[PDB]
Design a binder for this molecule. Structure first.
Ligand SMILES: CCCCCCCCCCCCCC(=O)OC[C@H](COP(=O)(O)OCC[N+](C)(C)C)OC(=O)CCCCCCCCCCCCC
Ligand SMILES: CCCCCCCCCCCCCC(=O)OC[C@H](COP(=O)(O)OCC[N+](C)(C)C)OC(=O)CCCCCCCCCCCCC
Ligand SMILES: CCCCCCCCCCCCCC(=O)OC[C@H](COP(=O)(O)OCC[N+](C)(C)C)OC(=O)CCCCCCCCCCCCC
Ligand SMILES: CCCCCCCCCCCCCC(=O)OC[C@H](COP(=O)(O)OCC[N+](C)(C)C)OC(=O)CCCCCCCCCCCCC
Ligand SMILES: CCCCCCCCCCCCCC(=O)OC[C@H](COP(=O)(O)OCC[N+](C)(C)C)OC(=O)CCCCCCCCCCCCC
Ligand SMILES: CCCCCCCCCCCCCC(=O)OC[C@H](COP(=O)(O)OCC[N+](C)(C)C)OC(=O)CCCCCCCCCCCCC
Ligand SMILES: CCCCCCCCCCCCCC(=O)OC[C@H](COP(=O)(O)OCC[N+](C)(C)C)OC(=O)CCCCCCCCCCCCC
Ligand SMILES: CCCCCCCCCCCCCC(=O)OC[C@H](COP(=O)(O)OCC[N+](C)(C)C)OC(=O)CCCCCCCCCCCCC
Ligand SMILES: CCCCCCCCCCCCCC(=O)OC[C@H](COP(=O)(O)OCC[N+](C)(C)C)OC(=O)CCCCCCCCCCCCC
Ligand SMILES: CCCCCCCCCCCCCC(=O)OC[C@H](COP(=O)(O)OCC[N+](C)(C)C)OC(=O)CCCCCCCCCCCCC
Ligand SMILES: CCCCCCCCCCCCCC(=O)OC[C@H](COP(=O)(O)OCC[N+](C)(C)C)OC(=O)CCCCCCCCCCCCC
Ligand SMILES: CCCCCCCCCCCCCC(=O)OC[C@H](COP(=O)(O)OCC[N+](C)(C)C)OC(=O)CCCCCCCCCCCCC
Ligand SMILES: CCCCCCCCCCCCCC(=O)OC[C@H](COP(=O)(O)OCC[N+](C)(C)C)OC(=O)CCCCCCCCCCCCC
Ligand SMILES: [Ca+2]
Ligand SMILES: [Ca+2]
Ligand SMILES: [Ca+2]
Ligand SMILES: [Zn+2]
Ligand SMILES: [Zn+2]
Length: 164
């Protein structure tokens, strides 16, 4: 299983997202592009349609935080847990969160924003985590790139339980 109890279906077909602030660890356009793609590779395996806004009410917020935000003032550090997003059902939740203490890249010698971003996009849509060691929605991080990315069966089949 991967799905969260409490009311996990968004009910919407059209998701609009808002990048609330950008890490300076890599270029804002490169962050935009990767976050673009990282919604869209989900869009391939879901009915949902994703559209950025710079201003207004977002479904999925994309937030970088370290320190004061409202979301654990001290936490983990450089490495460890890179994103810890939450999904709806318990009253609060459905946004993608990224610990700014990482050195965030899209490049081989830093923390890849992308595979973590796709898992954060998926947990926001109402899942929790996958158990299946090959899934993207799995918790552990190893390096894959934008070209060499795939979603796995449990990723696909978990969200089509909700949106299929
Ligand atoms: C041909 C045969 C090939 C065999 C290749 C086998 C596979 C090798 C994989 C190589 C890549 C390793 C990647 C790796 O796991 O990095 C681990 C971490 C960095 O990941 P990162 O998440 O930064 O760890 C963060 C946590 N931190 C700050 C507490 C360390 O960093 C560490 O855990 C620290 C590791 C010890 C570093 C010690 C460096 C020198 C320290 C000074 C020693 C002084 C002695 C006098
Ligand atoms: C006598 C010379 C003959 C000719 C030799 C040519 C050798 C190959 C040179 C090729 C150079 C290719 C172009 C190049 O400079 O790429 C460099 C990359 C960095 O790419 P990237 O960081 O994206 O560039 C960043 C630029 N920035 C800051 C504006 C965003 O990468 C780096 O800068 C990092 C280099 C790190 C290498 C680490 C090696 C690990 C060895 C581990 C062994 C363990 C033994 C215990
Ligand atoms: C024991 C250890 C076990 C490890 C198991 C694996 C663990 C997971 C993988 C470890 C990390 C692998 C990282 C990796 O994929 O590095 C590949 C690099 C760089 O890819 P990457 O840094 O993602 O590219 C970033 C590009 N960006 C910012 C524009 C999005 O690739 C290159 O930079 C290659 C560049 C090739 C340029 C060739 C250009 C054309 C030359 C044509 C020459 C022949 C003509 C006939
Ligand atoms: C063999 C005859 C020559 C054949 C053609 C060779 C062409 C290779 C083109 C290299 C283009 C540069 C790619 C690149 O950025 O590699 C370095 C990455 C990032 O450097 P940078 O992001 O500054 O990170 C540096 C610090 N570090 C290494 C401790 C994490 O640092 C890493 O952590 C990534 C390591 C995995 C991917 C490495 C891709 C280059 C393989 C080169 C193998 C040469 C023989 C050992
Ligand atoms: C006695 C001397 C002083 C002590 C030296 C000790 C040397 C061995 C220490 C091993 C443990 C090091 C812990 C460490 O900091 O890990 C550094 C990173 C891991 O953290 P991080 O950069 O977050 O992982 C990203 C890089 N990735 C995808 C390659 C895993 O991962 C990497 O940096 C791995 C780099 C792999 C190198 C393979 C060869 C790549 C050559 C590329 C050539 C391009 C030239 C332009
Ligand atoms: C095996 C393939 C070898 C390939 C050789 C290719 C030669 C190409 C030279 C021309 C390119 C030079 C690129 C360069 O300056 O790379 C520097 C890197 C990082 O310098 P650094 O200022 O830390 O990078 C700053 C920016 N950052 C953190 C965002 C990446 O430096 C590093 O990332 C570390 C490089 C040395 C790693 C050695 C660690 C283990 C030493 C084990 C020694 C055993 C003694 C027997
Ligand atoms: C050309 C190949 C370059 C690299 C050669 C690497 C050689 C080292 C292989 C080490 C295998 C150790 C055992 C193994 O199956 O670990 C697979 C992991 C986790 O599956 P998982 O059930 O999480 O393992 C659970 C327990 N654990 C972590 C304590 C071992 O999951 C992963 O490690 C994910 C790997 C995703 C693909 C990484 C790159 C290709 C590795 C292919 C190894 C095929 C071995 C049959
Ligand atoms: C065994 C030697 C084969 C040599 C093949 C030649 C390989 C040269 C590859 C060059 C590129 C190396 C890049 C490298 O960074 O690979 C590191 C990976 C982990 O990738 P990744 O998880 O992204 O590292 C990011 C930081 N992390 C760990 C904190 C999350 O590392 C892994 O995922 C684990 C690799 C373990 C390999 C050794 C497996 C156990 C061997 C036991 C039997 C030993 C008999 C001698
Ligand atoms: C001194 C200069 C030379 C140094 C040469 C390189 C040595 C580097 C030492 C550290 C190697 C870490 C490589 C790596 O990225 O592992 C990836 C993951 C675990 O990542 P993670 O859990 O973050 O561990 C990072 C390293 N640590 C513990 C120091 C913080 O794990 C995997 O992806 C799992 C696949 C490999 C599992 C291997 C199982 C090994 C035990 C097998 C015993 C078999 C007996 C029959
Ligand atoms: C340091 C000791 C010497 C080690 C020499 C080799 C060093 C490798 C460092 C680079 C690691 C990434 C290599 C690579 O691209 O792996 C995946 C390839 C095709 O990926 P691809 O579809 O080409 O797009 C690659 C995008 N890129 C470079 C930004 C990651 O292929 C696959 O997707 C198929 C399954 C995985 C195979 C991984 C190994 C590919 C062979 C790389 C060497 C090619 C030499 C002609
Ligand atoms: C006017 C007189 C001139 C006479 C010389 C003419 C030029 C002849 C050679 C031309 C080669 C052109 C290559 C090619 O099609 O380039 C385009 C694409 C790149 O599109 P691009 O968007 O960069 O691909 C994205 C992914 N990436 C970067 C990982 C590949 O790249 C591809 O799609 C990859 C192409 C791979 C081809 C592999 C063919 C086999 C090579 C090894 C054969 C022998 C092995 C023993
Ligand atoms: C140390 C370096 C580490 C990094 C290594 C990166 C490449 C690893 C190769 C692994 C090969 C096996 C898997 C594979 O299909 O990878 C293909 C990659 C990129 O694939 P992909 O992005 O799908 O390319 C699409 C088009 N396709 C499928 C027809 C090639 O193919 C490439 O991107 C090829 C790039 C160089 C192509 C050279 C073609 C030369 C044509 C002219 C030949 C004249 C006679 C020599
Ligand atoms: C050759 C000199 C050293 C070169 C070492 C290069 C080290 C760096 C490797 C870079 C890997 C880059 C990341 C990557 O693209 O991972 C690709 C996959 C990931 O496993 P997965 O994500 O589960 O996708 C599995 C395959 N699929 C598409 C059919 C479902 O992984 C794979 O599918 C690859 C599986 C490779 C199995 C290799 C097992 C050993 C073969 C030994 C045979 C010796 C016979 C004498
Ligand atoms: Ca929200
Ligand atoms: Ca962390
Ligand atoms: Ca940072
Ligand atoms: Zn949080
Ligand atoms: Zn994951």
């Amino acid at each position: 299983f991967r799905e969260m109890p409490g009311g996990p279906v968004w009910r919407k077909h059209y998701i609009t997202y808002r990048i609330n602030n950008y890490t300076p660890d890599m270029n804002r356009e490169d962050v935009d592009y990767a976050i673009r793609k990282a919604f869209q590779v989900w869009s391939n395996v879901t009915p949902l349609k994703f559209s950025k806004i710079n201003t207004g009410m977002a479904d999925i917020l994309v937030v970088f935080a370290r320190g004061a935000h409202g979301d654990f003032h001290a936490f983990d550090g450089k490495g460890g847990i890179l994103a810890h997003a939450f999904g709806p059902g318990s009253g609060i939740g459905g946004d993608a969160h990224f610990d700014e203490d990482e050195f965030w890249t899209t490049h081989s010698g830093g923390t890849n924003l992308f595979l973590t971003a796709v898992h954060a996009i998926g947990h926001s849509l109402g899942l929790g985590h996958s158990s299946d060691p090959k899934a993207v929605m799995f918790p552990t991080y190893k390096y894959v790139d934008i070209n060499t990315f795939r979603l796995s069966a449990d990723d696909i089949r978990g969200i089509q339980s909700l949106y299929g």
